Ligand binder design. Structure first.
Ligand SMILES: [Fe+3]
Length: 155
């Protein structure tokens, strides 16, 4: 309220495919589904918001040749989103994170990141921001993330 912005990073690639799922049962890593809503200025759900996610694989590598672990979606009538993925791996200098660009129809793009609770690197990574923490709880062999966006959109 409202979701803080952060840098894009060198590993963004435009033109991600449309998909809410980035993984299969055969994808290595700890299963993670992240879900929530996009709200505007009056705490009301926003429809048709573009959410474009990218992240490292379980071993901390980004795909620069293809679009593995890159995918975008649009919020539905209820303003909800869902992302089925795996927990991204650590890589040099950074705590654990998922990248996201959010764009409400006809508005500027918000570039930001999502962080994980209880990660030791949250204390070492200067880029870390507790306002961008997901809630994360166990769900069998995997995990469930919860995060709501608030965009600067008048209602
Ligand atoms: Fe990154």
């Amino acid at each position: 309220d409202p979701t803080p912005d952060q840098m894009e990073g060198p590993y963004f690639k435009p033109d991600s495919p449309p998909r809410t799922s980035l993984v299969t049962s055969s994808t290595p890593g700890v299963p993670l589904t992240v879900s929530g809503y996009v709200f505007g200025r009056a705490c009301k759900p926003l429809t048709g918001v573009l959410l474009d996610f990218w992240q490292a694989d379980t071993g901390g590598a980004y795909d620069m040749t293809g679009f593995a672990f890159r995918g975008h979606q649009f919020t539905g009538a209820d303003g909800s989103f869902t992302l089925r993925t795996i927990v991204p791996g650590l890589y040099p200098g950074r705590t654990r994170h998922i990248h996201v660009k959010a764009q409400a129809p006809g508005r500027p793009v918000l570039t930001t990141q999502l962080y994980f609770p209880g990660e030791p690197r949250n204390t070492t990574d200067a880029l870390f921001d507790p306002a961008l923490l997901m809630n994360v709880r166990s769900a069998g062999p995997g995990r469930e993330g919860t995060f709501d966006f608030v965009l600067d959109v008048a209602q």
